[PDB]
Amino acid sequence: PEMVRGQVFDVGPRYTNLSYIGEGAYGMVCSAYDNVNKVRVAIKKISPFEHQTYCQRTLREIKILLRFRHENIIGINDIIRAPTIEQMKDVYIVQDLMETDLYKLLKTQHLSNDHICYFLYQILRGLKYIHSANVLHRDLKPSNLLLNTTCDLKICDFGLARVADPDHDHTGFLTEYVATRWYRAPEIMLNSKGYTKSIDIWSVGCILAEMLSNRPIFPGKHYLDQLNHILGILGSPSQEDLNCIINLKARNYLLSLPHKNKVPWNRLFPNADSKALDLLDKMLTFNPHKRIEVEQALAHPYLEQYYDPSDEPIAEAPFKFDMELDDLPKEKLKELIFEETARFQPGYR
Ligand SMILES: Nc1ncnc2c1ncn2[C@@H]1O[C@H](COP(=O)(O)OP(=O)(O)NP(=O)(O)O)[C@@H](O)[C@H]1O
Ligand SMILES: *[C@@H]1[C@@H](C(=O)OCc2ccccc2)C(=O)CC[C@]1(C)C(=O)OC
């Protein structure tokens, strides 16, 4: 089997000519050539079966991305794994090949207002479809916004995605321990339940701010420092803001901090389009119930030159997982992953 940076990529003979792209905390991603369809592809290798939480990420990503079909959301073309469950140690997810991601782009390039506007439009267009299926992405960030040579944008990395159900869901804390928290909504760090579609809008606002300045707007080292970054710009929460914190210990924690004045957006972004800052203000609202919704954002004057609801599709029906996964042992999750990937095996019946 072909080898990339001393790592086995056992994907031949169909997929050949592998080249390292990059990696996240869980997967190593290569470009490859599909000799059957005669097209370029991306291939993500993950090795999750020794960790319950990694098994959760793999099963969630596979189940959701195989049900979604949208221009601004990455698709899964193929999945490779061993013919028996005992032999299955790695999973290879084959996707359309993109050229870069927004994290890498912002490291080398400053974006014009027209590019910012277009990227933001495509993010929200994809997010509109995700939310129309009653799904929360929960981990939006520059590194999982993929870009191609023609400036098309696709959202990827759905391992933390969940069906929205604030009143009856008990996900608890984001059991994610290796990746960045700079894009996480304040209520995530203050509460362990009741997450709504507004958490994704907060993330998009953080991404907008970073496109405006090429620097992350709230780059804390831990949740403690992270909250101080947020409050240092939004100012101390209002009385109504305090009423939306459910955890009384978290509310009493916020009450114990010194007072902080709000910083005007045009002090942070003095050269930015005023319409961009108006939309930014409505996305980075402390109170999730007052935060702008995805359809309202698409209709905001900042995005006027691209907004087109006739060409902003939605899901036919809200997505469902068909079971809860948080309490299953990793051995059971391994069986579910095997079953979910059997449709890509020869002889599936
Ligand atoms: N289809 C793709 N085409 C091109 N590059 C891709 C593709 N999928 C992923 N990448 C790159 O690979 C990186 C890692 O992918 P990702 O799906 O985020 O991996 P992960 O380890 O499972 N989760 P995370 O730690 O959140 O990044 C991305 O940030 C992109 O740079
Ligand atoms: C997109 C690309 C480009 O020229 O896009 C033109 C454009 C104008 C207005 C609105 C939207 C797009 C460019 O020059 C920068 C590279 C970029 C960002 C791209 O190729 O992404 C990888």
PDB file of N, CA and C in Angstrom, residues 21 42 71-74 96-109 111 115-116 118-123 141-156 207 211:
ATOM      1  N   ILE A  21      -2.178  16.664   2.091  1.00  0.00           N
ATOM      2  CA  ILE A  21      -2.745  18.011   2.177  1.00  0.00           C
ATOM      3  C   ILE A  21      -2.490  18.556   3.567  1.00  0.00           C
ATOM      4  N   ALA A  42     -10.266  13.857  -2.467  1.00  0.00           N
ATOM      5  CA  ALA A  42      -9.590  13.927  -1.175  1.00  0.00           C
ATOM      6  C   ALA A  42      -9.892  12.660  -0.386  1.00  0.00           C
ATOM      7  N   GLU A  71     -24.668  22.358  -2.441  1.00  0.00           N
ATOM      8  CA  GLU A  71     -23.464  22.887  -3.085  1.00  0.00           C
ATOM      9  C   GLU A  71     -22.430  23.420  -2.094  1.00  0.00           C
ATOM     10  N   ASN A  72     -22.858  23.907  -0.925  1.00  0.00           N
ATOM     11  CA  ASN A  72     -21.947  24.489   0.058  1.00  0.00           C
ATOM     12  C   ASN A  72     -21.657  23.550   1.228  1.00  0.00           C
ATOM     13  N   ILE A  73     -21.812  22.244   1.026  1.00  0.00           N
ATOM     14  CA  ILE A  73     -21.543  21.236   2.047  1.00  0.00           C
ATOM     15  C   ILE A  73     -20.783  20.109   1.357  1.00  0.00           C
ATOM     16  N   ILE A  74     -19.659  19.684   1.942  1.00  0.00           N
ATOM     17  CA  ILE A  74     -18.837  18.656   1.305  1.00  0.00           C
ATOM     18  C   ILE A  74     -19.611  17.337   1.290  1.00  0.00           C
ATOM     19  N   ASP A  96     -15.024  14.964  -2.430  1.00  0.00           N
ATOM     20  CA  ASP A  96     -14.543  15.841  -3.487  1.00  0.00           C
ATOM     21  C   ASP A  96     -13.305  16.595  -3.004  1.00  0.00           C
ATOM     22  N   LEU A  97     -12.378  16.867  -3.929  1.00  0.00           N
ATOM     23  CA  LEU A  97     -11.129  17.542  -3.577  1.00  0.00           C
ATOM     24  C   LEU A  97     -11.308  19.059  -3.605  1.00  0.00           C
ATOM     25  N   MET A  98     -11.022  19.709  -2.486  1.00  0.00           N
ATOM     26  CA  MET A  98     -10.916  21.160  -2.478  1.00  0.00           C
ATOM     27  C   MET A  98      -9.442  21.561  -2.440  1.00  0.00           C
ATOM     28  N   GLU A  99      -9.174  22.855  -2.683  1.00  0.00           N
ATOM     29  CA  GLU A  99      -7.796  23.326  -2.848  1.00  0.00           C
ATOM     30  C   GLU A  99      -7.174  23.844  -1.554  1.00  0.00           C
ATOM     31  N   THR A 100      -7.978  24.470  -0.709  1.00  0.00           N
ATOM     32  CA  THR A 100      -7.420  25.006   0.555  1.00  0.00           C
ATOM     33  C   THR A 100      -8.560  25.211   1.552  1.00  0.00           C
ATOM     34  N   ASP A 101      -8.241  25.821   2.682  1.00  0.00           N
ATOM     35  CA  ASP A 101      -9.287  26.179   3.631  1.00  0.00           C
ATOM     36  C   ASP A 101      -9.066  27.622   4.071  1.00  0.00           C
ATOM     37  N   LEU A 102     -10.086  28.205   4.717  1.00  0.00           N
ATOM     38  CA  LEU A 102     -10.028  29.635   5.026  1.00  0.00           C
ATOM     39  C   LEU A 102      -8.941  29.956   6.048  1.00  0.00           C
ATOM     40  N   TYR A 103      -8.647  29.020   6.956  1.00  0.00           N
ATOM     41  CA  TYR A 103      -7.539  29.213   7.886  1.00  0.00           C
ATOM     42  C   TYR A 103      -6.241  29.448   7.126  1.00  0.00           C
ATOM     43  N   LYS A 104      -5.915  28.559   6.180  1.00  0.00           N
ATOM     44  CA  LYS A 104      -4.664  28.721   5.436  1.00  0.00           C
ATOM     45  C   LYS A 104      -4.684  29.975   4.567  1.00  0.00           C
ATOM     46  N   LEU A 105      -5.836  30.289   3.987  1.00  0.00           N
ATOM     47  CA  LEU A 105      -5.943  31.474   3.104  1.00  0.00           C
ATOM     48  C   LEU A 105      -5.650  32.760   3.888  1.00  0.00           C
ATOM     49  N   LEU A 106      -6.258  32.921   5.063  1.00  0.00           N
ATOM     50  CA  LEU A 106      -6.076  34.126   5.865  1.00  0.00           C
ATOM     51  C   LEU A 106      -4.643  34.300   6.352  1.00  0.00           C
ATOM     52  N   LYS A 107      -3.840  33.233   6.362  1.00  0.00           N
ATOM     53  CA  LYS A 107      -2.453  33.352   6.793  1.00  0.00           C
ATOM     54  C   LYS A 107      -1.587  34.073   5.766  1.00  0.00           C
ATOM     55  N   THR A 108      -1.968  34.040   4.487  1.00  0.00           N
ATOM     56  CA  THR A 108      -1.169  34.633   3.423  1.00  0.00           C
ATOM     57  C   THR A 108      -1.830  35.811   2.724  1.00  0.00           C
ATOM     58  N   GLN A 109      -3.112  36.019   2.987  1.00  0.00           N
ATOM     59  CA  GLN A 109      -3.822  36.986   2.136  1.00  0.00           C
ATOM     60  C   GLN A 109      -4.850  37.806   2.899  1.00  0.00           C
ATOM     61  N   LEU A 111      -8.335  39.857   2.510  1.00  0.00           N
ATOM     62  CA  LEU A 111      -9.496  39.740   1.638  1.00  0.00           C
ATOM     63  C   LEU A 111     -10.139  41.098   1.387  1.00  0.00           C
ATOM     64  N   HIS A 115     -14.827  39.802  -1.531  1.00  0.00           N
ATOM     65  CA  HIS A 115     -14.519  38.389  -1.204  1.00  0.00           C
ATOM     66  C   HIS A 115     -15.120  38.040   0.155  1.00  0.00           C
ATOM     67  N   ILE A 116     -14.969  38.926   1.134  1.00  0.00           N
ATOM     68  CA  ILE A 116     -15.568  38.666   2.444  1.00  0.00           C
ATOM     69  C   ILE A 116     -17.063  38.451   2.297  1.00  0.00           C
ATOM     70  N   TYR A 118     -18.926  37.476  -0.240  1.00  0.00           N
ATOM     71  CA  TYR A 118     -19.192  36.237  -1.017  1.00  0.00           C
ATOM     72  C   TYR A 118     -18.937  35.017  -0.135  1.00  0.00           C
ATOM     73  N   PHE A 119     -17.808  34.998   0.565  1.00  0.00           N
ATOM     74  CA  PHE A 119     -17.518  33.853   1.465  1.00  0.00           C
ATOM     75  C   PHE A 119     -18.599  33.787   2.546  1.00  0.00           C
ATOM     76  N   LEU A 120     -18.922  34.927   3.156  1.00  0.00           N
ATOM     77  CA  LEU A 120     -19.946  34.933   4.194  1.00  0.00           C
ATOM     78  C   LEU A 120     -21.283  34.453   3.641  1.00  0.00           C
ATOM     79  N   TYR A 121     -21.645  34.904   2.431  1.00  0.00           N
ATOM     80  CA  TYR A 121     -22.884  34.452   1.804  1.00  0.00           C
ATOM     81  C   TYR A 121     -22.916  32.938   1.657  1.00  0.00           C
ATOM     82  N   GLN A 122     -21.829  32.352   1.134  1.00  0.00           N
ATOM     83  CA  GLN A 122     -21.806  30.908   0.925  1.00  0.00           C
ATOM     84  C   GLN A 122     -21.853  30.140   2.251  1.00  0.00           C
ATOM     85  N   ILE A 123     -21.202  30.654   3.303  1.00  0.00           N
ATOM     86  CA  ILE A 123     -21.293  30.005   4.613  1.00  0.00           C
ATOM     87  C   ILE A 123     -22.748  29.931   5.066  1.00  0.00           C
ATOM     88  N   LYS A 141     -15.438  26.850  12.074  1.00  0.00           N
ATOM     89  CA  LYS A 141     -14.181  27.576  12.256  1.00  0.00           C
ATOM     90  C   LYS A 141     -13.516  27.743  10.886  1.00  0.00           C
ATOM     91  N   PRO A 142     -12.526  28.650  10.756  1.00  0.00           N
ATOM     92  CA  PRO A 142     -11.906  28.837   9.425  1.00  0.00           C
ATOM     93  C   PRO A 142     -11.326  27.560   8.829  1.00  0.00           C
ATOM     94  N   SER A 143     -10.788  26.659   9.651  1.00  0.00           N
ATOM     95  CA  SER A 143     -10.146  25.477   9.072  1.00  0.00           C
ATOM     96  C   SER A 143     -11.123  24.447   8.525  1.00  0.00           C
ATOM     97  N   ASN A 144     -12.420  24.527   8.811  1.00  0.00           N
ATOM     98  CA  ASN A 144     -13.307  23.576   8.145  1.00  0.00           C
ATOM     99  C   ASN A 144     -14.229  24.265   7.137  1.00  0.00           C
ATOM    100  N   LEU A 145     -13.831  25.432   6.653  1.00  0.00           N
ATOM    101  CA  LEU A 145     -14.451  26.064   5.492  1.00  0.00           C
ATOM    102  C   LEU A 145     -13.490  25.867   4.330  1.00  0.00           C
ATOM    103  N   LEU A 146     -13.829  24.940   3.416  1.00  0.00           N
ATOM    104  CA  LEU A 146     -12.972  24.585   2.290  1.00  0.00           C
ATOM    105  C   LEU A 146     -13.266  25.471   1.085  1.00  0.00           C
ATOM    106  N   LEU A 147     -12.206  25.739   0.318  1.00  0.00           N
ATOM    107  CA  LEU A 147     -12.265  26.621  -0.872  1.00  0.00           C
ATOM    108  C   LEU A 147     -11.606  25.949  -2.080  1.00  0.00           C
ATOM    109  N   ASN A 148     -12.129  26.221  -3.276  1.00  0.00           N
ATOM    110  CA  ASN A 148     -11.577  25.683  -4.550  1.00  0.00           C
ATOM    111  C   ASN A 148     -11.047  26.845  -5.399  1.00  0.00           C
ATOM    112  N   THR A 149     -10.404  26.508  -6.516  1.00  0.00           N
ATOM    113  CA  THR A 149      -9.810  27.537  -7.410  1.00  0.00           C
ATOM    114  C   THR A 149     -10.856  28.553  -7.884  1.00  0.00           C
ATOM    115  N   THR A 150     -12.120  28.141  -8.031  1.00  0.00           N
ATOM    116  CA  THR A 150     -13.164  29.057  -8.482  1.00  0.00           C
ATOM    117  C   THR A 150     -13.820  29.835  -7.323  1.00  0.00           C
ATOM    118  N   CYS A 151     -13.242  29.817  -6.124  1.00  0.00           N
ATOM    119  CA  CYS A 151     -13.747  30.524  -4.916  1.00  0.00           C
ATOM    120  C   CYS A 151     -15.046  29.881  -4.386  1.00  0.00           C
ATOM    121  N   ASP A 152     -15.427  28.679  -4.846  1.00  0.00           N
ATOM    122  CA  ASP A 152     -16.526  27.998  -4.165  1.00  0.00           C
ATOM    123  C   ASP A 152     -16.108  27.602  -2.748  1.00  0.00           C
ATOM    124  N   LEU A 153     -17.063  27.654  -1.821  1.00  0.00           N
ATOM    125  CA  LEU A 153     -16.838  27.331  -0.416  1.00  0.00           C
ATOM    126  C   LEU A 153     -17.735  26.165  -0.008  1.00  0.00           C
ATOM    127  N   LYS A 154     -17.175  25.209   0.742  1.00  0.00           N
ATOM    128  CA  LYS A 154     -17.933  24.073   1.272  1.00  0.00           C
ATOM    129  C   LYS A 154     -17.596  23.849   2.741  1.00  0.00           C
ATOM    130  N   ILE A 155     -18.635  23.711   3.562  1.00  0.00           N
ATOM    131  CA  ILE A 155     -18.480  23.363   4.976  1.00  0.00           C
ATOM    132  C   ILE A 155     -18.153  21.874   5.097  1.00  0.00           C
ATOM    133  N   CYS A 156     -17.160  21.536   5.935  1.00  0.00           N
ATOM    134  CA  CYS A 156     -16.823  20.134   6.215  1.00  0.00           C
ATOM    135  C   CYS A 156     -16.736  19.888   7.725  1.00  0.00           C
ATOM    136  N   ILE A 207     -16.033  34.200  12.691  1.00  0.00           N
ATOM    137  CA  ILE A 207     -15.346  34.034  11.415  1.00  0.00           C
ATOM    138  C   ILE A 207     -15.399  35.325  10.597  1.00  0.00           C
ATOM    139  N   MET A 211     -12.232  37.511   9.148  1.00  0.00           N
ATOM    140  CA  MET A 211     -12.029  37.908   7.754  1.00  0.00           C
ATOM    141  C   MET A 211     -11.812  39.416   7.627  1.00  0.00           C
TER     142      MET A 211
END
